């Protein structure tokens, strides 16, 4: 899709526990195509991001419980320049939020929660589809700007959210992912690099 | 070797990881490049509890501000199409107004936000004043900047924590010199108890 | 053996302040001064907190030379370089003397204390393979130690929680955690399933 140098990290993982980020962001080098986010406790980074070794003063009785079940958690693999795949190695399910998956289901952006089954190996992100969809937004703006969508709206296209154990959505007591006892937000770097490029082509000309 | 670290805030919420500047001239913008030792891109920093105003203001950060280390001085050039407000106790104390003074930097402008020699001289005469006087100089090693919205004297946003998007700069150079003095200032006057 | 034998997190009441510090040398001091680039010093004096109140701002003035942490052999010691006592809560130590795991030990200025012992922990990790996943997972608390500057907490004081103290840190012993991990990745899983709704 692009020619400029590949990113140092192919993604960033931020663990959460409700509306609070617990622990510090995990950066996965591009040299580590597959990363594991389990509920175990090995501090050494590398290919494993152990959520079980993250502390939190706010942590409750209900979260200590859920965290106990993360297990081998899942895996995040980078295949083609910016394509991500997920494989649930956990005994429990995992809930993923993906536009590539929403589109594939004929659903509207963000109007669906995808439950992955243990042992499942599904594709959750297509760099090209992302890149396309960006210019898609940049175009209509250049238009709605001359006829008369921000960085936070479109950066979502380069983001992935995943809740371990508990699920949210329109069929669970939890309405938003900021209500699950433990989850993570993944930022795809390549998708962001392409976005940095696209952002420069949205003639500021927005007016104040 | 980093001459300064930068922390981004949204109101009174610390958002994102601390950026460490390794390049003598960098930029803090509202874009999304995740790996530029010369670009602290705020656009890629999330905030699960981000409101509309913040989100709206982030849109106008644009090319943001360009900070840059010429010799022993730091300059801030507003690249954004919106103004950027600076609160530099080292810059204010130069023009004279109450250190908490915020100075507006219109688009296309640039201000000298810090001067080493000045600081060093202020650190020297402080030693005679006492521990307390030296301990407070850490504020002199800090600089706060807001994007798009202003604050302080008569912008009815009296404190930085009121602005939607602001950033704090810690000058490592000055902090290191302060530390060398501090470890020699002895002990505080005013004491304290373990129970109170 | 890990690059950093431990990681330290600074807190002001119930809030995380500053970045996480990773110790590479066998010696490091957590003081209240301002050097930002010393692999042997975790200077809290430069850390800023917009929501900082008066009491924290006052206690930060008495951290002084702070605490010195040692990693000699397979043990860890905490020395009080501050002219004010420090208060530690190390389960590993507390058990060694038979005190409620949540015991807070006071280290007067100039004094020191063996805060952790690897062989002791390794042994506890062993005789646990007999109690199940649950038992092992909880051995992570053994890998964490909390210290408070100037103000004490727990019994004997009015502040009953470490989150009530103005300035405190939390250490994670990477070595122990690593050894624990190896035994966890094999302890199977918990018996009491977890609903996806409860």
Swiss-Prot record, chain A:
| Localization | Cytoplasm; Nucleus
What are the GO MF terms of this UniProt record? chromatin binding; collagen binding; DNA-binding transcription activator activity, RNA polymerase II-specific; DNA-binding transcription factor activity; DNA-binding transcription factor activity, RNA polymerase II-specific; filamin binding; I-SMAD binding; identical protein binding
Domain MH2: from-to ranges: 10-208
Q: Name the major location.
A: cytoplasm
* SS bonds (residue pairs): none
Linked residues for Glycyl lysine isopeptide (Lys-Gly) (interchain with G-Cter in ubiquitin): 178
Q: What is the effect of changing residue 155 to S?
A: No effect on heterotrimerization. Partially diminished transcriptional activation
| Source superkingdom | Eukaryota
Task: Indicate the impact reported for residue 38 to N.
Answer: In a colorectal cancer sample; somatic mutation
Function per UniProt: In muscle physiology, plays a central role in the balance between atrophy and hypertrophy. When recruited by MSTN, promotes atrophy response via phosphorylated SMAD2/4. MSTN decrease causes SMAD4 release and subsequent recruitment by the BMP pathway to promote hypertrophy via phosphorylated SMAD1/5/8. Acts synergistically with SMAD1 and YY1 in bone morphogenetic protein (BMP)-mediated cardiac-specific gene expression. Binds to SMAD binding elements (SBEs) (5'-GTCT/AGAC-3') within BMP response element (BMPRE) of cardiac activating regions.
How does the record describe its quaternary structure?
Monomer; in the absence of TGF-beta activation. Heterotrimer; on TGF-beta activation. Heterotrimer composed of two molecules of a C-terminally phosphorylated R-SMAD molecule, SMAD2 or SMAD3, and one molecule of SMAD4 to form the transcriptional active SMAD2/SMAD3-SMAD4 complex. Found in a ternary complex composed of SMAD4, STK11/LKB1 and STK11IP. Found in a complex with SMAD1 and YY1. Identified in a complex that contains at least ZNF451, SMAD2, SMAD3 and SMAD4. Interacts with ATF2, COPS5, DACH1, MSG1, SKI, STK11/LKB1, STK11IP and TRIM33.
Q: What does the record say about domains?
A: The MH1 domain is required for DNA binding. The MH2 domain is required for both homomeric and heteromeric interactions and for transcriptional regulation. Sufficient for nuclear import.
Protein family: Belongs to the dwarfin/SMAD family.
Disease per record is:
Pancreatic cancer: A malignant neoplasm of the pancreas. Tumors can arise from both the exocrine and endocrine portions of the pancreas, but 95% of them develop from the exocrine portion, including the ductal epithelium, acinar cells, connective tissue, and lymphatic tissue.
- Name this polypeptide is given: Mothers against decapentaplegic homolog 4
Q: Which organism is it from?
A: Homo sapiens
Upper classification of the source organism reads:
Eukaryota, Metazoa, Chordata, Craniata, Vertebrata
Query: Corresponding gene?
Result: SMAD4
From Swiss-Prot, chain B:
> Does the entry feature the keyword Transferase, yes or no?
no
**Outcome recorded upon mutating residue 97 to A:** Loss of interaction with PMEPA1
For biological process, the GO terms are:
activin receptor signaling pathway; anatomical structure morphogenesis; anterior/posterior pattern specification; aortic valve morphogenesis; cell differentiation; cell fate commitment; cell population proliferation; determination of left/right asymmetry in lateral mesoderm
Using the record's annotation, list all stretches that form the MH2 domain. Answer: 3-196
Molecular function via GO: chromatin binding; cis-regulatory region sequence-specific DNA binding; co-SMAD binding; disordered domain specific binding; DNA-binding transcription activator activity, RNA polymerase II-specific; DNA-binding transcription factor activity; DNA-binding transcription factor activity, RNA polymerase II-specific; DNA-binding transcription factor binding
Subcellular localization, per the record? Cytoplasm; Nucleus
KW Ubl conjugation (keyword) present: yes
Effect recorded for residue 47 to K: Found in a patient with Marfan syndrome-like phenotype; uncertain significance
Q: Show the GO cellular component annotation of the record.
A: activin responsive factor complex; chromatin; cytoplasm; cytosol; heteromeric SMAD protein complex; homomeric SMAD protein complex; intracellular membrane-bounded organelle; nucleoplasm
Subunit structure comment from the entry: Monomer; in the absence of TGF-beta. Heterodimer; in the presence of TGF-beta. Forms a heterodimer with co-SMAD, SMAD4, in the nucleus to form the transactivation complex SMAD2/SMAD4. Found in a complex with SMAD3 and TRIM33 upon addition of TGF-beta. Identified in a complex that contains at least ZNF451, SMAD2, SMAD3 and SMAD4. Interacts (via the MH2 domain) with ZFYVE9; may form trimers with the SMAD4 co-SMAD. Interacts with TAZ/WWRT1. Interacts with FOXH1. Interacts with SNW1. Interacts with CREB-binding protein (CBP) and EP300. Interacts with SNON. Interacts with ALK4/ACVR1B.
Q: Which family does it belong to?
A: Belongs to the dwarfin/SMAD family.
Q: Tied to what disorder?
A: Congenital heart defects, multiple types, 8, with or without heterotaxy: An autosomal dominant disorder characterized by congenital developmental abnormalities involving structures of the heart. Common CHTD8 features include double-outlet right ventricle, unbalanced complete atrioventricular canal, and valvular anomalies. Vascular anomalies include dextroposition of the great arteries, anomalous pulmonary venous return, and superior vena cava to left atrium defect.
Q: What is this protein called?
A: Mothers against decapentaplegic homolog 2
Its ancestry begins with: Eukaryota, Metazoa, Chordata, Craniata, Vertebrata
Query: Its encoding gene is what?
Result: SMAD2
